[PDB]
Each structure stands twice: as structure tokens, then as C-alpha cells.
């Protein structure tokens, strides 16, 4: 039904927290093809369904493949969750054509938050995870749980995740304490609110 994340003429920020990596990538590839400029944030907190060993073997067949065969130059394998997401986008888009390459170059994937995009990130129409590993439904694996077993960028990324989360928790806690104060004096001035002839036909359309 209406896809409630999707089009905006310009936006584009996507929350990856416990979203499904290939499902999020599929919408992101479509927004990128449409000419959007897409920033996926919290790539460390994104999820892939399936049992850890079987996810670990897929990537690992790339990791033995990272070694050989040798000029140098690529075939290449990214250790870290934004770059794993970028590797996913560079298969989702037709990846041999200027329209596709120009769409790829409009994506960025950032780990934690970049330095501040404090306009909220938004969830994709049910991309998100809880159920899609179903209760049970066996394991899932986080990209920041994959990339600890593959390497840095990850490691710095999860240490910067930690600090950016701790400080924005503190800054959230107090902004909420003032917002509640503003809400309470706002609601009392709607409880009061002066009168009507025209004006209360609108709250009979909530």
C-alpha cells in the first residue's frame, strides 16, 4: 500500500537500524535510479537474516578469494559495514552502464552518524527486522557483528558509534525535558483556547 518512505523531491536519509540489508538496498537502488542522492546511516546496526555460519561462509569464500588470483587491482572485498552496503548497491544497480554508475555515485553509506545529520533518519516501509528474524526463526547477523570477524573500518566505526550514541543520548535527555515543559503549557492553552464559531469544526476533524 502507499509507500510511506520512498519519494521526497530532495531528502534523502535512511535509518539502517535493524533494517533488512537487501530490502533497504533494493529501495535505495530504486531511489538512486530515480535521481535521488541517498545517505544510509547506521550501517553497523543493519541486519541480514540467516544462520551466522552460512552468512560467514558466503563472505569467507570472498575472503580466500581476496588473496588470489593476482595482478592486484580488484577483485576486492571491503571489510566494513558501510562498504559491505556499498558492495550490495554495486550489485543491485545494473553495474556496467553510465546511468547505473551515476546512480551508484549518488549513494553514501555512513557508519554511526556522519558529523551531524541531525534531521532524523527515516525508516523504510516495512524494511525493518523484528520479525524477518521471526521470534526464533533462527539467527540473524548484524553487519557490525559480521565485520568484527572481517576487520577495521569496523572497529573504529563501532568505537565512534559508541561515543556519538553516548553524547546524543545526553543531548536528547535534556531537549526532551524542555519539550515536555513546552507541551504542557501548549495543551493547557488548547484546553482554554478562547472560543470559536469556525475554529472547533477543525478538531471535530481530527
Amino acid at each position: 500500500m502507499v509507500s510511506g518512505s520512498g519519494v521526497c523531491a530532495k531528502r534523502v536519509v535512511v535509518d539502517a537500524r535493524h533494517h533488512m540489508l537487501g530490502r533497504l538496498a533494493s529501495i535505495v537502488a530504486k531511489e538512486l535510479l530515480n535521481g535521488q542522492r541517498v545517505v544510509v546511516v547506521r550501517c553497523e546496526e543493519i541486519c541480514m537474516s540467516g544462520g551466522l555460519v552460512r552468512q560467514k561462509m558466503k563472505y569467507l569464500r570472498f575472503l580466500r578469494k581476496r588473496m588470489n588470483t593476482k595482478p592486484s587491482h580488484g577483485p576486492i572485498h571491503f571489510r566494513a559495514p558501510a562498504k559491505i552496503l556499498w558492495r550490495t548497491i554495486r550489485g543491485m544497480i545494473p553495474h556496467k552502464t553510465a546511468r547505473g554508475e551515476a546512480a551508484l555515485a549518488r549513494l553514501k553509506a555512513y557508519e554511526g552518524v556522519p558529523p551531524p545529520y541531525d534531521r532524523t533518519k527515516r525508516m523504510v516501509i516495512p524494511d525493518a527486522l523484528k520479525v524477518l528474524r521471526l521470534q526464533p526463526g533462527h539467527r540473524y547477523c548484524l553487519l557490525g557483528q559480521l565485520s568484527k570477524e572481517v576487520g577495521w573500518n569496523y572497529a573504529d566505526t563501532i568505537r565512534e558509534l559508541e561515543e556519538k550514541r553516548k553524547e546524543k543520548a545526553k543531548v536528547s535527555y535534556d531537549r526532551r525535558k524542555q519539550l515536555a515543559k513546552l507541551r504542557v503549557k501548549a495543551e493547557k492553552a488548547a484546553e482554554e483556547k478562547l472560543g470559536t464559531q469556525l475554529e472547533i469544526l477543525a478538531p471535530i476533524k481530527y
Binding site: 503549557k185 492553552a189 478562547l194
Partner: protein, 134 residues
């Protein structure tokens, strides 16, 4: 979710689609753990395999087994639950519906005017903030 599935009465449920074109329902007869008969007072009964029809919070006061007269009586006793229904939990659609009805002249002047006042309220609200602030 596998969810609520069952086998009991009193529990109103709300639609995740079908024909009809409605619809809200309550489960009258309960008839294993998939199949169930859902009906409504002024709505048509159907027996569905209905995983993917989900049941709302507000519950109506009846006991187990309902034919038609009994169901009607229960509805009469309750009502109120439909209001919660017009509003809220599932339920929502009468407040929303109040929304859809509105791209229309008389309806458009009622709106500028809600707006115009809304502004006066922002201005009073803002004055208040300024006295509170410092």
C-alpha cells in the same frame, strides 16, 4: 507475528482486506485454531482462515456462543466500543474518514478559518512562552 489465533468471542477484529468493501468484525464461533466465524451487527458473517486479519485491543462484553439475535443484543449492550472504534486502537477510521470528506468550498472556508484562529492561538501561546522564558 504468529500472533493471536483462536477460538474466542468478545474480541473485535479489524480488516487486512477482502471484498465487502468494509469492515470490522467480532468472532462469534470458534472453530479450530485457524478457522473462525466472524460477524458484526450490521455486517455480513464470514467463515475465514484469517491469520492476516488481526484483532484490535477493545473487547466487547459477551460470553461464548452467538446466533444472530444474541449477537444483536450484545452489540446493543456494548456500542461504546464502536466509538472507541471511530477513534482508536486498531480502529481509527471515523476520525480519518472525517478527514477524507473535505476538498470542497464550504469545506475549504471551514479550513482557512480553523487555520486563522490556529494562528491567533500560536500568537497567544507564543506570548505565554515569552512571559515564562524570562
Amino acid at each position: 507475528m504468529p500472533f493471536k489465533r483462536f477460538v474466542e468471542i468478545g474480541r473485535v477484529a479489524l480488516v487486512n482486506y477482502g471484498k465487502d468493501y468494509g469492515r470490522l468484525v467480532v468472532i462469534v464461533d470458534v472453530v479450530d485454531q485457524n478457522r473462525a466465524l466472524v460477524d458484526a451487527p450490521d455486517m455480513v458473517r464470514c467463515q475465514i482462515n484469517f491469520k492476516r486479519l488481526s484483532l484490535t485491543d477493545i473487547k466487547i462484553d459477551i460470553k461464548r456462543v452467538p446466533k444472530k439475535t444474541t449477537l444483536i443484543k450484545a452489540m446493543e449492550e456494548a456500542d461504546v466500543k464502536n466509538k472507541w472504534e471511530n477513534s482508536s486502537w486498531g480502529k481509527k477510521l471515523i476520525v480519518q474518514k472525517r478527514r477524507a470528506s473535505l476538498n470542497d468550498f464550504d469545506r475549504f472556508k471551514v479550513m482557512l478559518a480553523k487555520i486563522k484562529r490556529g494562528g491567533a492561538i500560536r500568537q497567544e501561546l507564543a506570548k505565554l512562552k515569552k512571559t515564562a522564558a524570562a
